[PDB]
């Protein structure tokens, strides 16, 4: 009753899943049930400061939801039926959950991910998903593409270790260099 009344009155639901609380996946925010009704009013701030924030966030939500559906499908009837793009969706969403969403609040690097670092990380992960999708649609086999771009995937997953103390200018340059090298690596793998 207390939770139901609180949800009736409040506007933001940061629901926590205990299956994610275990296995040390903090924050354990259950991305499915969780919601926030302040996105519409924050669209103005996003347009003012980080214009691509809402579209990147919506893309991330779509990826997570699609991969949740595909995870139900794979848990039911295995991974043989899934298409290539399904494999990329699942892999990128697992990457997002393992690196982006999972934020250790007691490590030096991820104790406080500022707004600009979070925006850069969404840009990196969404760009990785888009590049993999484009490369596979070009005809490259996903297994070989993953074998060739494991370095790019590890660079993307390791972007959470970038120190926010280095300043917005220095880290954003590092993220731009990461994106450029990622694009070059994906182009080389596709070629």
């Amino acid at each position: 009753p207390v939770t139901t009344a609180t949800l009736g009155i409040t506007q933001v639901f940061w629901g926590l899943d205990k299956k994610l609380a275990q296995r040390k996946h903090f924050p354990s925010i259950n991305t499915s049930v969780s919601y926030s009704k302040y996105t519409n009013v924050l669209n103005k701030f996003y347009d003012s400061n980080y214009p691509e924030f809402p579209v990147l966030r919506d893309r991330m939500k779509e990826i997570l939801s699609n991969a949740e559906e595909l995870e139900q499908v794979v848990q039911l009837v295995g991974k043989s039926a899934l298409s290539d793009s399904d494999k990329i969706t699942l892999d990128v969403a697992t990457l997002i959950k393992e690196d982006f969403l999972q934020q250790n609040g007691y490590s030096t690097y991820d104790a406080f991910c500022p707004i600009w670092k979070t925006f850069d990380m969404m840009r990196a992960f969404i760009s990785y998903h888009d590049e993999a999708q484009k490369a596979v649609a070009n005809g490259a086999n996903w297994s070989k593409l993953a074998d060739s771009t494991g370095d790019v995937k590890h660079a993307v997953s390791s972007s959470k270790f970038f120190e926010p103390s280095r300043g917005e200018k220095e880290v954003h340059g590092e993220f731009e260099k990461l994106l450029s090298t990622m694009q070059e690596r994906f182009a080389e793998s596709t070629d």
């Binding site: 848990q75 039911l76 009837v77 295995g78």
Partner: protein, 214 residues
């Protein structure tokens, strides 16, 4: 580890029906997997037997072809390739329904439109050429039978893998998830009954106190 079901008596009955249906389906599918696996063991034994038969038949067909070529004094392969306008042998798929599956089995056929062989213009050894053609036709019939058996084997193995996967999925996900949902719904119904009991006890206490006052 459960289903997001609203605790209600109707929902409890629906989940009990789901559990009963899942148990019945699990038993049925396990028995179907056992029957299909027996059929699969028979199929693979016939595959081994047909492989041995294929070996001996191809050996004798190669011997007959070599004898025919020696009798003719030249390789008839070029003439056969030249006279390849149409094929006198064809295979028609038949949907044989073994057990519950509908595995396709090839059925050989002979087309008399181009049934004429390359015996004419071979120079010599017409009888040897005809005997080699008959041996090769028997080998082709054996090949059609073996191909039908192998296609049935592949389809049956795929269907058995799917059925065993679904049996395991039921027994390890659907039955435990439904059982957990049943347990949670029963617990929540007991909780609602206990809350109603306490509220009625409070009402009874108030009525008794009023009676004592009056």
């Amino acid at each position: 580890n459960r289903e997001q079901v609203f605790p209600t008596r109707m929902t409890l009955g629906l989940m009990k029906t789901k559990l009963k249906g899942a148990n019945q389906g699990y038993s049925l599918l396990k028995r179907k997997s056992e029957a299909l696996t027996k059929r699969f063991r028979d199929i693979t034994k016939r595959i081994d037997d047909a492989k041995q038969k294929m070996g001996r038949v191809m050996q004798t067909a190669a011997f007959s072809l070599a004898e025919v070529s020696y009798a003719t004094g030249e390789n008839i392969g070029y003439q056969v390739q030249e006279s390849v306008s149409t094929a006198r042998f064809k295979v028609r798929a038949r949907q044989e329904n073994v057990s519950g599956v509908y595995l396709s089995q090839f059925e050989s056929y002979i087309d008399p439109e181009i049934n004429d062989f390359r015996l004419t213009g071979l120079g010599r050894g017409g009888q040897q050429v005809q005997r080699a053609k008959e041996i090769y036709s028997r080998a082709v019939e054996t090949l059609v039978e073996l191909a039908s058996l192998q296609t049935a084997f592949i389809i049956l193995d795929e269907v058995i893998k799917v059925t065993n996967r679904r049996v395991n999925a039921i027994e390890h996900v659907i039955i435990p998830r439904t059982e957990n949902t049943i347990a949670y719904i029963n617990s929540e119904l007991d909780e609602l009954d206990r809350e109603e009991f306490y509220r009625l006890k409070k009402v009874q206490e108030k009525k008794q106190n009023e009676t004592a006052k009056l």
